Amino acid sequence: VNLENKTYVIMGIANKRSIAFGVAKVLDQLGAKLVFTYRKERSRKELEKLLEQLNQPEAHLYQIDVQSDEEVINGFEQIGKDVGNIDGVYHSIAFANMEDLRGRFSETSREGFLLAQDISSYSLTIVAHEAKKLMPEGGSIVATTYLGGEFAVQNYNVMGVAKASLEANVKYLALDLGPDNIRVNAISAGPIRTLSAKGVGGFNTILKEIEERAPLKRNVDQVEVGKTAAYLLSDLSSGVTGENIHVDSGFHAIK
Amino acid sequence: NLENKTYVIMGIANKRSIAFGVAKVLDQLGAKLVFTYRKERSRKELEKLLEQLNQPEAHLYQIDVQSDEEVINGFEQIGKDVGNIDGVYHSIAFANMEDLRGRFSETSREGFLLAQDISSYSLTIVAHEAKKLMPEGGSIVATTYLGGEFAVQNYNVMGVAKASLEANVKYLALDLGPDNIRVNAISAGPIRTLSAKGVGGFNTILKEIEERAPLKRNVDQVEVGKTAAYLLSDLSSGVTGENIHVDSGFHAIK
Amino acid sequence: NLENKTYVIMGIANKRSIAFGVAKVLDQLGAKLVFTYRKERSRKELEKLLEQLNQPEAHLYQIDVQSDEEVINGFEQIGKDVGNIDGVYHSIAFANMEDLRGRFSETSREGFLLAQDISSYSLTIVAHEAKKLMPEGGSIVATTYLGGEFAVQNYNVMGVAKASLEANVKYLALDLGPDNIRVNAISAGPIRTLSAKGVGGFNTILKEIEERAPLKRNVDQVEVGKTAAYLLSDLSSGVTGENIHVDSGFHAIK
Amino acid sequence: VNLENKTYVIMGIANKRSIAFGVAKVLDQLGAKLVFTYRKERSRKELEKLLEQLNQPEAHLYQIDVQSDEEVINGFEQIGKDVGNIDGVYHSIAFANMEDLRGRFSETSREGFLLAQDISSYSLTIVAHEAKKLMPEGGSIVATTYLGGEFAVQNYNVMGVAKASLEANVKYLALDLGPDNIRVNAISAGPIRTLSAKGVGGFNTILKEIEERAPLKRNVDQVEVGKTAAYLLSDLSSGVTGENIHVDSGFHAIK
Ligand SMILES: NC(=O)c1ccc[n+]([C@@H]2O[C@H](COP(=O)([O-])OP(=O)(O)OC[C@H]3O[C@@H](n4cnc5c(N)ncnc54)[C@H](OP(=O)(O)O)[C@@H]3O)[C@@H](O)[C@H]2O)c1
Ligand SMILES: NC(=O)c1ccc[n+]([C@@H]2O[C@H](COP(=O)([O-])OP(=O)(O)OC[C@H]3O[C@@H](n4cnc5c(N)ncnc54)[C@H](OP(=O)(O)O)[C@@H]3O)[C@@H](O)[C@H]2O)c1
Ligand SMILES: NC(=O)c1ccc[n+]([C@@H]2O[C@H](COP(=O)([O-])OP(=O)(O)OC[C@H]3O[C@@H](n4cnc5c(N)ncnc54)[C@H](OP(=O)(O)O)[C@@H]3O)[C@@H](O)[C@H]2O)c1
Ligand SMILES: NC(=O)c1ccc[n+]([C@@H]2O[C@H](COP(=O)([O-])OP(=O)(O)OC[C@H]3O[C@@H](n4cnc5c(N)ncnc54)[C@H](OP(=O)(O)O)[C@@H]3O)[C@@H](O)[C@H]2O)c1
Ligand SMILES: CCc1ccc(Oc2ccccc2)c(O)c1
Ligand SMILES: CCc1ccc(Oc2ccccc2)c(O)c1
Ligand SMILES: CCc1ccc(Oc2ccccc2)c(O)c1
Ligand SMILES: CCc1ccc(Oc2ccccc2)c(O)c1
Ligand SMILES: N[C@@H](CCC(=O)O)C(=O)O
Ligand SMILES: N[C@@H](CCC(=O)O)C(=O)O
Ligand SMILES: N[C@@H](CCC(=O)O)C(=O)O
Ligand SMILES: N[C@@H](CCC(=O)O)C(=O)O
């Protein structure tokens, strides 16, 4: 691709291992202007330090907790005032309690079920609504999912039902916003060592199964997710919406 | 033959409810049935509808599935009243008109989370409570629609709630499998019911089935009920985590 | 209850055939059964396995599905001998043994087309001839495996033939639905049979089911048979173009 | 997606409307060296005229009928001697007799069913076996499918079963060749007016349905397929194998 003169919002960098920082490095290398969103103070401090690795001439950082309508609304409105219109959004945001994740699925609390839906699925819908205002000639929105949204995976529990909700959200958003020339798609990433992965029980056995069974016989990394994001966020994928691309060494295709 | 079987049926409002098709079939097969409801008006309908069944007695429980206490205490009383059960038919969903009748991107946070709560989470907590009355095993069936698998015009917030429900069925199947409790869904084709008045363009959905589905006709509540009898019985003993389309073959075409 | 129903069962070779689990179930339910075989050996095997069914007489027809004339003439004779039928169970597949181990990219043209011919095209031509014996409608069921949906090690050429068969089921559903003929598939979990010996690594396939499937056990032929009875009966009115997994839930997990 | 110093073999150009020619135009624009295979001499003649629109300094044209083991085997052997090792193959080849693309599917002949399997699915398998010989360090193999392989579509009939067969071929090949660092993927193209499309009954009503019902409300073109091929054929799609990308205006995702 070639992304000079384009601007993308990346939501959900926490540190150097985040899937979303792989996305940022790829887009930055390709010429894009980037805008970053975070929830914790600590995530902002990591962003400021990670920006030194990038070619970005200015820091554009906005605090946006996606539990709050007003923060998503005011945040995107401020972004539009600061950088003008945008070309797409990369959504790399999910959350569930340890306490629900690490017990039987049938014991999941209502509170923890709805928390995981709210942050990991509904956030895309409201982000799309606000981001559309900054994309009057169209644009591209990408969210990050996992195969536990399509099949029951041991231990992924409440988050597999949130990812199923997220993948349907992508399809319904693609149908709604398609007439505005806004494409919406998902990347189904293979397991990658991150801060959030520490919440998944048996994560090391999940990585070891990919090496042993997946067609490519190896795990993927953040930058490979980034390279598919660049495709999805750019005019290379102009015909493609409502799609879920598995960046997982082909694990999705085998049993 | 379901004699000496007992099933709980959740979600009859009136004679057109999909769950009443399920009841008629199970009743005809000899099952003892227990019914749950939310509104007073639904209990009144159930009382009238039971005169068409062969049930020697009315076993009726109010359970609003938005309340943990109601589900917990509801299934507790069912166990005291009738003993162990063999399965549960879940036929419950809800969403606001306000969110089936605005653009999907304009869905409210409270409307999205309401539909998830009633239409998806309810299965999880009902399974947790019902398992206490199934020590030997049993069978749980929920009702979904093809808009959980593909984006269908107007179905909007309910399609994301059914995608959530269908994953719920798979994760419950994995969890409760070792306890010998199967969990499955029936993906029913469109049927004129009270809830169907919330879906915009409903008559256009029905016509498209008669015109394009393999059987070239719509299904009815009794056909759902006949597939529920298979899922709830020993005929399906090998089958869990599955979604059977009772929809004249519409799911298979494009 | 299948009394006064008549079904043709294709693909019994011995006591371990999936189609023999089917036959035991349909028979127990009071169906009249017709059997087709390829080689005399399966005829004799059949003749003795029949001793264990309550079929008061032996309707046995040699049909090699590689031959149009045999399929055509065989179904014509069935009709003269017994009259109109209510359905067909198809349990027929083949691939050369060297094609069910090692490297898929080394598959010969001849063995790729052989597998397609026997394991997929044979459904098409059987449907066409059996339709003639179903003027009021009926039900056709074929046996498939999860290897038609996902690349499974060793299954190789048979995985591509099963993918072909599953699409075959869907196109036949669409074509034949207006004639009130339903066409569905059962995706059986691994079961030790004669043909099962041909598949590289079969024993490791079984183990993985016990360890990882939701029910934590393997299925058997009779469980495939009970789901066949559902698909072949009026209980599954409204269901066509479907693939029901009878696999302890293995399809639903990763 | 800079492809200078890459070489790709493109199979299945017949004329300017061919999907494989949209692929050719994109890969050539990106700097790749291109080799073309054809069956009919009239296709050779059209390639010769079409090369005048590309930046290729030489015509590398090989006649390969994929019904012939020898022609596939010798053609790829000849290709390796002329240009050396390659980076990937784009497979744009299918065939069925016209009477099997309208009316009733249950009436399909054995001979027409096996013909469509042979040309449209098995050809991928033998091409991958022969192409792997020219890709010692890895590579990428892309085939062209349709949604009729995943769902029963009116009139598509015998070709639907041949595309289901192709899509499983792609998966099994992905698994087999993954340890060799060969990726295998499909593109599921939406309907495009081509010489082959003339054999599909009701084709004009298929096109119209996409415009009326697909998320983007417009049909796709050959160049859009090409842009996705450039992605799948390049290092951008590392970590992606056994996948089927729909380039169809989102129509796959709706019902
Ligand atoms: N790692 C994997 O193996 C894997 C595989 C497939 C998919 N995914 C998906 O990839 C995405 C990114 O996760 P990751 O693995 O890169 O882990 P990560 O670095 O921990 O990133 C997760 C991000 O989510 C943000 N987040 C959580 N709740 C939020 C809220 N209410 N408002 C705003 N942001 C919030 C966190 O921000 P703060 O830290 O500031 O709170 C953090 O930046 C997630 O959707 C995840 O499910 C991960
Ligand atoms: N009709 C169709 O075309 C169709 C097709 C496919 C799937 N479905 C699904 O089929 C199921 C049955 O619906 P239906 O069409 O038969 O309509 P229905 O007759 O309106 O039944 C819907 C039921 O949901 C119950 N319910 C709603 N909220 C509840 C709550 N908070 N607590 C307890 N019960 C609650 C209602 O009870 P009250 O009236 O007492 O409040 C009512 O009995 C639903 O899951 C629906 O999504 C319907
Ligand atoms: N066993 C499993 O784990 C499993 C799992 C899923 C699906 N399946 C499927 O189940 C079906 C039956 O296999 P099985 O396991 O039951 O093995 P089986 O007992 O060996 O049955 C295979 C049958 O195919 C028949 N057959 C082969 N070619 C024929 C031809 N050209 N014309 C007529 N009949 C022909 C054989 O008849 P002859 O012996 O007379 O030649 C034999 O009766 C197959 O479709 C298989 O792919 C099996
Ligand atoms: N057009 C569409 O709407 C569409 C949509 C989705 C997928 N597809 C797929 O796209 C691919 C390309 O088709 P197209 O639409 O671009 O039509 P096309 O221009 O007619 O191309 C079809 C190609 O197949 C080649 N072919 C047929 N038999 C062959 C053989 N035995 N050996 C070698 N080559 C052979 C033809 O070569 P000769 O002319 O030299 O015989 C021709 O170049 C096909 O796989 C098709 O199924 C098309
Ligand atoms: C097993 C691969 C995987 C690892 C990390 C993930 O991110 C999470 C997980 C749970 C809560 C929040 C984010 C994820 O979705 C999938
Ligand atoms: C289009 C077929 C259809 C009709 C009715 C439904 O039930 C609902 C719908 C919305 C809210 C609550 C229940 C449903 O799920 C699917
Ligand atoms: C691995 C489960 C399985 C076992 C047996 C099968 O029947 C065959 C296998 C190969 C050739 C012919 C029939 C089958 O299809 C799948
Ligand atoms: C309806 C979209 C469509 C158009 C053309 C195609 O190419 C063919 C069709 C039949 C025989 C050979 C090639 C194809 O596969 C799909
Ligand atoms: N001991 C944890 C593993 C922690 C992790 O892998 O994230 C478990 O298996 O529950
Ligand atoms: N009147 C609704 C649709 C009515 C229906 O459910 O058929 C509309 O806005 O189209
Ligand atoms: N085919 C490209 C890269 C594709 C791959 O990632 O295998 C190459 O030969 O460099
Ligand atoms: N309309 C013709 C063919 C359409 C075309 O492919 O040009 C038919 O339906 O038979």
Describe the 3D structure.
It is classed as oxidoreductase. The entry lists the keywords short-chain dehydrogenase/reductase superfamily, fatty acid biosynthesis, lipid synthesis, safabi, fabi. It forms a tetrameric assembly. The entry is titled "Crystal structure of S. aureus FabI in complex with NADP and 5-ethyl- 2-phenoxyphenol". Chains A, B, C, D: enoyl-[acyl-carrier-protein] reductase [NADPH]. The structure is a homotetramer. Chain A is an alpha/beta fold and 255 residues long. Chain A has a single domain (1-255), classed as Rossmann fold (3-Layer(aba) Sandwich). Chain A is 42% helix and 15% strand. Chain A is built from eight helices and seven strands, in the order βαβαβαβααβαβααβ. Chain A has helices at 19-29, 41-50, 69-83, 98-101, 110-132, 158-177, 203-213, 222-233, and strands at 7-11, 33-38, 61-63, 88-91, 139-145, 182-189, 244-247. Chain A has a seven-stranded parallel β-sheet, with helices on both faces. In chain A, α5 (110-132) runs parallel beside α6. Chain A is globular. Chain A starts with 6 loop residues before the first strand and ends in an 8-residue tail after the last strand. At the A-C interface, loops of A face loops of C. The structure holds NADP nicotinamide-adenine-dinucleotide phosphate (4 copies), 5-ethyl-2-phenoxyphenol (E9P) (4 copies) and glutamic acid (4 copies). The site of one 5-ethyl-2-phenoxyphenol (E9P) has 12 residues of chain B, from loops.
